[PDB]
Design an enzyme around this catalytic site. Sequence first.
Site, mmCIF file in Angstrom:
data_model
loop_
_atom_site.group_PDB
_atom_site.id
_atom_site.type_symbol
_atom_site.label_atom_id
_atom_site.label_comp_id
_atom_site.label_asym_id
_atom_site.label_seq_id
_atom_site.Cartn_x
_atom_site.Cartn_y
_atom_site.Cartn_z
ATOM 1 N N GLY A 1 0.821 -0.742 -0.184
ATOM 2 C CA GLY A 1 0.119 0.189 -0.390
ATOM 3 C C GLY A 1 1.048 1.150 0.099
ATOM 4 O O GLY A 1 1.768 1.582 -0.379
ATOM 5 N N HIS B 1 7.455 -4.256 1.715
ATOM 6 C CA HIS B 1 7.240 -3.540 0.628
ATOM 7 C C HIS B 1 8.552 -1.606 0.865
ATOM 8 O O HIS B 1 7.371 -1.269 1.917
ATOM 9 C CB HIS B 1 6.082 -2.994 -0.130
ATOM 10 C CG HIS B 1 5.395 -3.608 -1.315
ATOM 11 N ND1 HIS B 1 4.731 -4.207 -0.231
ATOM 12 C CD2 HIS B 1 5.718 -4.063 -2.482
ATOM 13 C CE1 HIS B 1 4.503 -4.826 -1.930
ATOM 14 N NE2 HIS B 1 4.945 -5.092 -2.862
ATOM 15 N N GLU C 1 11.227 1.791 -2.332
ATOM 16 C CA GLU C 1 10.601 2.558 -3.972
ATOM 17 C C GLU C 1 10.310 4.195 -3.839
ATOM 18 O O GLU C 1 11.315 4.620 -4.171
ATOM 19 C CB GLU C 1 9.459 2.238 -4.580
ATOM 20 C CG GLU C 1 8.202 1.557 -3.290
ATOM 21 C CD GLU C 1 8.788 0.285 -2.846
ATOM 22 O OE1 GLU C 1 8.821 0.699 -1.440
ATOM 23 O OE2 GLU C 1 7.296 0.240 -2.588
#
Lengths: 140, 405, 127, 70
Positions: free
Chosen positions: C23, C51, C54
């Site tokens: 998310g 995650h 990035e």
Amino acid sequence: AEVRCSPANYAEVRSPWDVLADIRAAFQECMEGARTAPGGLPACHVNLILIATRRASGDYRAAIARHLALAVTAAEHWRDENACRVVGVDLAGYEDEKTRAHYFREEFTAVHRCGLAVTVHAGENDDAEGIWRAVFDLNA
Amino acid sequence: SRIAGAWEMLPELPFADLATWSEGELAWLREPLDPRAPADQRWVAGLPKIELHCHLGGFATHGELLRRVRNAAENPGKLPPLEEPRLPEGWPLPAQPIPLAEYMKLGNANGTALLRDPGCLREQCRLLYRHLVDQGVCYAEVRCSPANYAEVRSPWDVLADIRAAFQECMEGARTAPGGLPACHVNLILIATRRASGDYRAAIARHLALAVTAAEHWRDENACRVVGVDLAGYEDEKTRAHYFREEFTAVHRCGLAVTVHAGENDDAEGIWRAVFDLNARRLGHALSLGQSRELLRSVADRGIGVELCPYANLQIKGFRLDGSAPGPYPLLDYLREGVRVTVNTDNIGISAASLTDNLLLAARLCPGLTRLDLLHLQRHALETAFCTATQRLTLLRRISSGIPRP
Amino acid sequence: AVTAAEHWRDENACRVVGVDLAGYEDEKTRAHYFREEFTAVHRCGLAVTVHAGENDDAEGIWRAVFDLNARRLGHALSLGQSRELLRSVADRGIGVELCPYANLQIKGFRLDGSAPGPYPLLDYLRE
Amino acid sequence: SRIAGAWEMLPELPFADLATWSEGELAWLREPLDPRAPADQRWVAGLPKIELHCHLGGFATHGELLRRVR
Ligand SMILES: Nc1ncnc2c1ncn2[C@@H]1O[C@H](COP(=O)(O)OP(=O)(O)OP(=O)(O)O)[C@@H](O)[C@H]1O
Ligand SMILES: [Mg+2]
Ligand SMILES: [Zn+2]
């Protein structure tokens, strides 16, 4: 005088410990060179305070941990009263709501356990809340 | 032809040179080990070993070594009176398990009372390195507590002297191919926790010293401080997760962490060490078998487990030759896939070495095979803290240094 | 995820083998805000992936590695900024997953050696 | 003969079974990859691959696959 230095920023092939040792050796030799004043004491006595600097973004927590560990080891290393010593640590750098003093308690627990003086930059770009966090949550 | 015949079932093998050993010797190596046979003892002695759990303060605790450690002090007048703590009946194989506090007390002839003098420290380091090279160890990690050995010299001075002694020992014995040391020794600092008193400040000082030492010496072909330990008294109120804030700076620095857990604690302490202190290795994880999910997690996370059989039998007590503490967990750990190693713990107070440790590991669990010993060696090679190039060089040396039956 | 992992246990069959933390992410949604939620997942003994990297610095990656106990890191493009964190990821054996097309389209990288910086795949293999 | 030739470099190889390759073939496996060459594309297509990061909800979004799903 109490000069603040960040030896870990000056380490590319020599260790930060080597940088701190070189700085303190230069200070001590320049102390012994100027043996003025009565009682056989140095004209100006200078102690070291290690700087833990914090940035808005990037990688700085590892630097803070390295500075705190180096300050603890240096304080335990040199204990001669009539010589240059490391006497405390610092918490400087960029300051806002998200980089206040109370976000740094866990790594300063080791410094407080060792029994080392702590000083913090607060109130420059923050309201009284930052000063309160520095005083009562980090024990500056 | 040997390689071609055993080209299949190669990845199951622990090393590379295992394939070039003929069907007869492979079948011999798959049979269970017999510690009574002199040939098996000779083969285990000749095997190149890797040491991961050795305490510097528990080497010269009994016997003539003490005299060799005693007759090296700079000021012999300051030395305490020579007292040898008595051992109970059958000390190598005691009939009854014995507690941990008297276990620590048994090594009172060495350590703080004796290693405070620098000459004794240097002689102890030299004797320990000589013992390690005699045992055939190609890589060892020694645990030390320099801060306990300071009265006018800083603990940094003690650590520097210890590393200098080990470095000169390594440089002196420049045997073996490639101009490399016979045994490569690294350092791990111990953060001791006690039932009561002041220990957390000592733990913080040890962690700071370990971080500074790791950042100072960066030569790969040299003794380096490669990790920290959390040893000492353990119980419900001295679990690993009480020490997160002290250890987070170490996690900021990027230093390997090893934890004592499960010696006299349930699997809860092991879980706390694994998932709240981020231990890369677990020392004496005897109580890991009660929890299946934790065993699976330790298996798939590649977290090493260090077992010392002599210490486990002396402290907890175990049944020998298959005759209630439960069975020794070497075999089910090996079958479940967890990375398990056999070490010495304190060489002196246990009065045993790596060869005796492996032989008694075979003794405690009947059915153990020499292939299991090679698998333990591979697990120790992978689980140790070392550079990748050092890992490849150690793998090649151990593969090319296993004796033929 | 916990119930599904407990339900299906056939090794030679499809199973739920890990959880994800995906998310939108920022300073206010780091991995350390989900420690109490993921404590149950760690207790049950299930894999975790995150995650991170990035669109954030290495602090989020450190949080994903060290107090969320992630076994894999998703799009850890900023890991070159932290030498100590990179060494910890290397020695701990934590996997790092890279998607070249997604990284090229989202962040943008230079192709054929012609400032987002260089793609860290070769460097990550080197270290 | 091939496997005995390349025995001493076995740990470097990711897979043991490719140690039975030619010295010329192994030298072909050491120089930089050429994505433009059709032979390299065919070899990469024929390689066995392991996948670890695939979202089920972003597979069939365009093309004929969307209509076939619909
Ligand atoms: N198997 C074990 N389980 C738990 N704690 C242990 C074990 N073996 C050793 N220890 C503890 O770890 C410490 C590490 O040894 P170290 O060399 O630092 O101490 P020492 O010189 O023996 O002195 P002292 O024990 O008096 O502090 C030992 O002192 C002991 O307190
Ligand atoms: Mg002791
Ligand atoms: Zn230990």
